[PDB]
């Protein structure tokens, strides 16, 4: 019994350790969010299938690493879901062929937010998985340890919903004018979803975001967001109603708005946060 990764990295008979670099494409699913499917990354085979039956489990202690380490979740092992990090050894999966077959492990994260996310830097550790191999032949009891690393920069969604983009830049027409903000949201299943804006505002009504352009700034204007004409102030929750698998546009438009005094030539910039909530 031995195993290898998609890139050919091997752990031989008797167990050992290997680093597994994976391209992540996390996604929200119903009641759990996919972090990574390793069934395309890690493979094992039985070296003497005529004589011996090999048994493989996911051993307790298997857990997330890095920024994900505080997150509870589930692991799908050969189709069935089990708590993650593993606090008890999974059932055994039989290996009975010299042909390399997948180690059927997929890691999920339990939603703790509405549409939040956590940034994963490329090259960082995301999980350590302990594969335990036994058999019906002798008392062989071998540990194959897989250190799972992100091969790319992604953000893992931590909520029941996800967004079209985590960072959006729009460019207003030269003053005066407005521009649509492309921003949509969807949920794995129906959620009663709302959102609120956050940022530095210039007015009493907390509805005009300050111009913070550092170089050659204009005077007398800020940025004001509207939703089909309705002014959206900061820290005021807007309801999107029920949001399901079909993307829903937040319907936001950016505008210039007078903040007081002579309007002067120069650059305009406002940074505005969007945070989703359940209702």
């Amino acid at each position: 019994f031995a195993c290898k990764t998609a890139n050919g990295t091997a752990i031989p008979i008797g167990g050992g350790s290997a680093n597994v670099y994976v391209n992540l494409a996390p996604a929200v699913n119903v009641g759990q969010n996919l972090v990574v499917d390793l069934s395309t990354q890690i493979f094992c085979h039985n070296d003497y299938p005529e004589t011996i039956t090999d048994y493989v489990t996911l051993q307790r202690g298997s857990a997330y690493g890095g920024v994900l380490s505080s997150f509870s979740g589930t692991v799908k092992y050969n189709g069935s879901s089990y708590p993650f990090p593993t606090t008890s050894e999974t059932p055994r999966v039989v290996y009975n062929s010299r042909t390399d077959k997948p180690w059927p492990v997929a890691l999920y994260l339990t939603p703790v937010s509405s549409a939040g996310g956590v940034a994963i830097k490329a090259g960082s550790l995301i999980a350590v998985l302990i594969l335990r191999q036994t058999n019906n032949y002798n008392s062989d009891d071998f540990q194959f340890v897989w250190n799972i690393y992100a091969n790319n920069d992604v953000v893992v969604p931590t909520g029941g919903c996800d967004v079209s983009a985590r960072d959006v830049t729009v460019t207003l027409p030269d003053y005066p004018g407005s521009v649509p903000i492309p921003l949509t949201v969807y949920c794995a299943k129906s959620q009663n979803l709302g959102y609120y804006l956050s940022g530095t505002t210039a007015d009493a009504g907390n509805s005009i975001f300050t111009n913070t352009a550092s170089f050659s700034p204009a005077q007398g204007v800020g940025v004001q967001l509207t939703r089909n004409g309705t002014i959206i102030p900061a820290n005021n929750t807007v309801s999107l109603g029920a949001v399901g698998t079909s993307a829903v546009s937040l319907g936001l438009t950016a505008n210039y708005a007078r903040t007081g005094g002579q309007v002067t030539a120069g650059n305009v910039q406002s940074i505005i946060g969007v945070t989703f909530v359940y209702q």
Partner: peptide, 14 residues
């Protein structure tokens, strides 16, 4: 925040 919007614009004199 879950999302960060950057709004750029400019005032041109005339």
């Amino acid at each position: 925040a879950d999302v960060t919007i950057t709004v750029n614009g400019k005032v041109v004199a005339k």
